[PDB]
């Protein structure tokens, strides 16, 4: 814990596309490593204001900060300081698709994030491109070793204001940058909140817990 | 660093073959790989790459929907499935290895390094 201190904060930078509107993003973050939270705040720097869901973007801004049982090893918080990458995609029952790719670096005595995304292919008149969307509900990702790898696959759900729940097939793959003792298949359980938003969505506010189960 | 491609050949208008691209001297997933073809006379040209974890795949307007580009991270090699072949995908087709490791949606030549020598694909 010379490396992973109890209290540790992160920048992040995302630059990305959703259905061809460019954008980024810069953002300051906090949180209890080994507790399992954390918060940040998020500014679009460019392309604002964004003319879809802020929610898709929201898990895209830290497994590092996951809480786990001391029988279970923590694959992403030993890849420090060198690090871990993690590419995802995301298929939504509509047709879009998110793909994101991330570099996570610890600087200075601070977690460094840089993340791309793109996001195609969402209807017009969807809930996505139309700001329809009311925040992620609870998710469980199943975490599972493979080819050298930590994978994780999510049924992922947004609540929507017209009622009911939108949904994403959700995998990533995480990996260490150098080589780390992976862990056999867990469970996470993960709560992501918007907890304070300006009215376009240009500075945005998160929570999130994330606790590891057997 | 070191690239050898395989499984081209001649085949009939609507064959299926699979290209592999072997691969040696460099930690396989730290490179997104690609895929090029050079037809008589024109300039090589991309054909699909690949992320380092298979997620983010890219593919020229041309072979969208009857090509497949995928790797394995443990066998270390890229593969090309290519379906629906049709006479003008007649080429070579060689393999290559991205500039930095963080690739992104980078579809030219300059953006790639470590070049195969390739494997011909005649289609009649």
């Known amino acids: 814990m010379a490396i992973i201190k109890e209290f540790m904060r992160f920048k992040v930078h995302m630059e990305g596309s959703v259905n061809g509107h460019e954008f980024e993003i810069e953002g300051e973050g906090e949180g209890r490593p080994y507790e399992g939270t954390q918060t940040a705040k998020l500014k679009v720097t460019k392309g604002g204001p964004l003319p879809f869901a802020w929610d898709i973007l929201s898990p895209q801004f830290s497994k590092a900060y996951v809480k786990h049982p001391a029988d279970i090893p923590d694959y992403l918080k030993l890849s420090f300081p060198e690090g871990f990458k993690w590419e995802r995609v995301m298929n939504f029952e509509d047709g879009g698709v998110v793909t994101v790719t991330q570099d996570s670096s610890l600087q200075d005595g601070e977690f460094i994030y840089k993340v791309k995304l793109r996001g195609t292919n969402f209807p017009s008149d969807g809930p996505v491109m139309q700001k329809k969307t009311m925040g992620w509900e609870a998710s469980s990702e199943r975490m599972y070793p493979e080819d050298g790898a930590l994978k994780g696959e999510i049924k992922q759900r947004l609540k929507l204001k017209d009622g009911g729940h939108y949904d994403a097939e959700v995998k990533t793959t995480y990996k260490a940058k150098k080589p780390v003792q992976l862990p056999g298949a867990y469970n996470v359980n993960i709560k992501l909140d918007i907890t304070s938003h300006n009215e376009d969505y240009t500075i945005v506010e998160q929570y999130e817990r994330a606790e590891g189960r057997h | 660093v070191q690239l050898v491609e395989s499984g081209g050949g001649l085949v009939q208008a609507g064959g299926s073959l699979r290209l592999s691209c072997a691969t040696s001297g460099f930690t396989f997933s730290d490179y997104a790989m690609g895929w090029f073809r050079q037809a008589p006379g024109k300039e090589r040209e991309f054909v699909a790459a690949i992320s380092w974890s298979g997620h983010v795949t890219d593919y020229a307007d041309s072979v969208k929907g009857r090509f497949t580009i995928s790797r394995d991270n443990v066998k270390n090699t890229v593969y090309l499935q290519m379906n629906s072949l049709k006479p003008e995908d007649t080429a070579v087709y060689s393999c290559?290895?991205?500039?930095?490791?963080?690739?992104?949606?980078?579809?030219?030549?300059?953006?790639?390094?470590?070049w195969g020598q390739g494997t011909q694909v005649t289609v009649s």
């Open positions: 290559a290895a991205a500039k930095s490791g963080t690739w992104w949606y980078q579809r030219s030549e300059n953006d790639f390094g470590s």
